[PDB]
Amino acid sequence: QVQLRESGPSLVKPSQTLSLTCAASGFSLSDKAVGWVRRAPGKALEWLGSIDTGGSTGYNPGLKSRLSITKDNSKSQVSLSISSVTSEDSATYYCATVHQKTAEGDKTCPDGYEHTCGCIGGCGCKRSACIGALCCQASLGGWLSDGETYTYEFHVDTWGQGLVVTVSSASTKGPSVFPLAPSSKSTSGGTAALGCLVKDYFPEPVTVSWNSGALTSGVHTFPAVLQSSGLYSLSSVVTVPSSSLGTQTYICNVNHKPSNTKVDKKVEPKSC
């Protein structure tokens, strides 16, 4: 299957250059074009640029001066660099295979218009209600379909997963991981919720698995809170049989790539 994976720093200082990389799998970079798209928090999708099968690049015109896309078919990687970034560039960045084609010969007339060849000068488009050989004139709202009708096709095919990027002068902070053990009164009968608190990290993102990924059912990782301190905290819990709270091993696997921190926190049962 076609897969795309973004890598690069999740934190960049203001005025630095953000450089990302896209790893392709399931196809060859000499067969499909790859493009970059970003969505800042709350705002709309924003096109960045693409590089086609021939190494030819196209960019968002307003951002072109600060962009640069390169490719290496061998390593099967697509790169993106954005210079002089600011808070405005904080966003989720996607790479994706994109469809790009320039088509010609579209003499079809829009809705409410009709194709005719009985106009002065040959064939064109007239309003359906217009009558006469001058209906392809501009004064009557028509046009002659002569020569070059270039139509541009674009759409994103397979979307990457997306890399979170924060542009800030605040410094990285790795998380403190604390066990969340159920007490004898916080259980829920035959099951109980145990978890991990991932406290005071910056920037996003953080991932949590359980037992190296062998425990997935009943796992609920909550979205992070952004605290007035500018730091993030999130929690992950898993619901397990109450019988096993003190005989089965439960370990949360926390990953905070922006600080190069990984924590395996074994959650032990409380006594009372």
């Binding site: 541009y152 397979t158 978890g195």
Partner: protein, 213 residues
């Protein structure tokens, strides 16, 4: 930017339409695409070439166009369809894509689901690091709107409280969390702390005490 409505709403099982307005140099060129961005998930290509459904897109999603205004029509509305919807189209270059301003879809008629609250006290490890965080986890509720209040013993607490905006889980219900940061001294000095979660006029209170270990 292509012009879309800020928001639209349709009832369960019924049908909704989302417009995408531009010029003859983008939407007019007749190759409009549509994308579904569900919170937390990667974007999903719905439509391309005005009307062609992308791979795996159910038949319920229909694209159309008349002149310089395209339309995405979603039928048999399901709760999972709530998401931000974007149109796009090239402009004067196959490598110059323009996106719409986005439309938030609210599916109406979804029934109330009451929150489950789990409250954890500070771990013994954190207390030894001279910190203390109460963790109030809130799950499985709809609509995604709660107010969280904290009590020390029976007195309200406003300092040190951090609460998330609710966000949608996989099961079409919402999740939220609230954190109360204390010193180990404060935690130990009170008889209990409480997290009070109010959802649709009903309040769930969970309580923890330093005496419990």
């Amino acid at each position: 930017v292509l012009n879309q409505p800020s928001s639209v709403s349709g009832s369960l099982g019924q049908r909704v339409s989302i417009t995408c307005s531009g010029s003859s140099s983008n939407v007019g060129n007749g190759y409009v695409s549509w994308y579904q961005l569900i919170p937390g998930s990667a974007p999903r290509t719905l439509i391309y070439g005005d009307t062609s459904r992308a791979s795996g897109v159910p038949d319920r999603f229909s694209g159309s166009r008349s002149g310089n205004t395209a339309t995405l029509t979603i039928s048999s509305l399901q709760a999972e369809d709530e998401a931000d919807y974007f149109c796009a189209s090239a402009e004067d270059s196959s490598s110059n894509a323009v996106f719409g301003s986005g439309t938030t879809l609210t599916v109406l008629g979804q029934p109330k689901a009451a929150p489950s609250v789990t409250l954890f006290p500070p771990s013994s490890e954190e207390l030894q690091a001279n910190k203390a965080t109460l963790v109030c986890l809130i799950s499985d509720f709809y609509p995604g709107a709660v107010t969280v209040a904290w009590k020390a013993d029976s007195s309200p607490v406003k300092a040190g409280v951090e609460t998330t905006t609710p966000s949608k889980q996989s099961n079409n219900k919402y999740a939220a969390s609230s954190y109360l940061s204390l010193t180990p001294e404060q935690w130990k000095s009170h008889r209990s702390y409480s997290c009070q979660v109010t959802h649709e006029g009903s309040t769930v209170e969970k309580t923890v005490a330093p005496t419990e270990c």
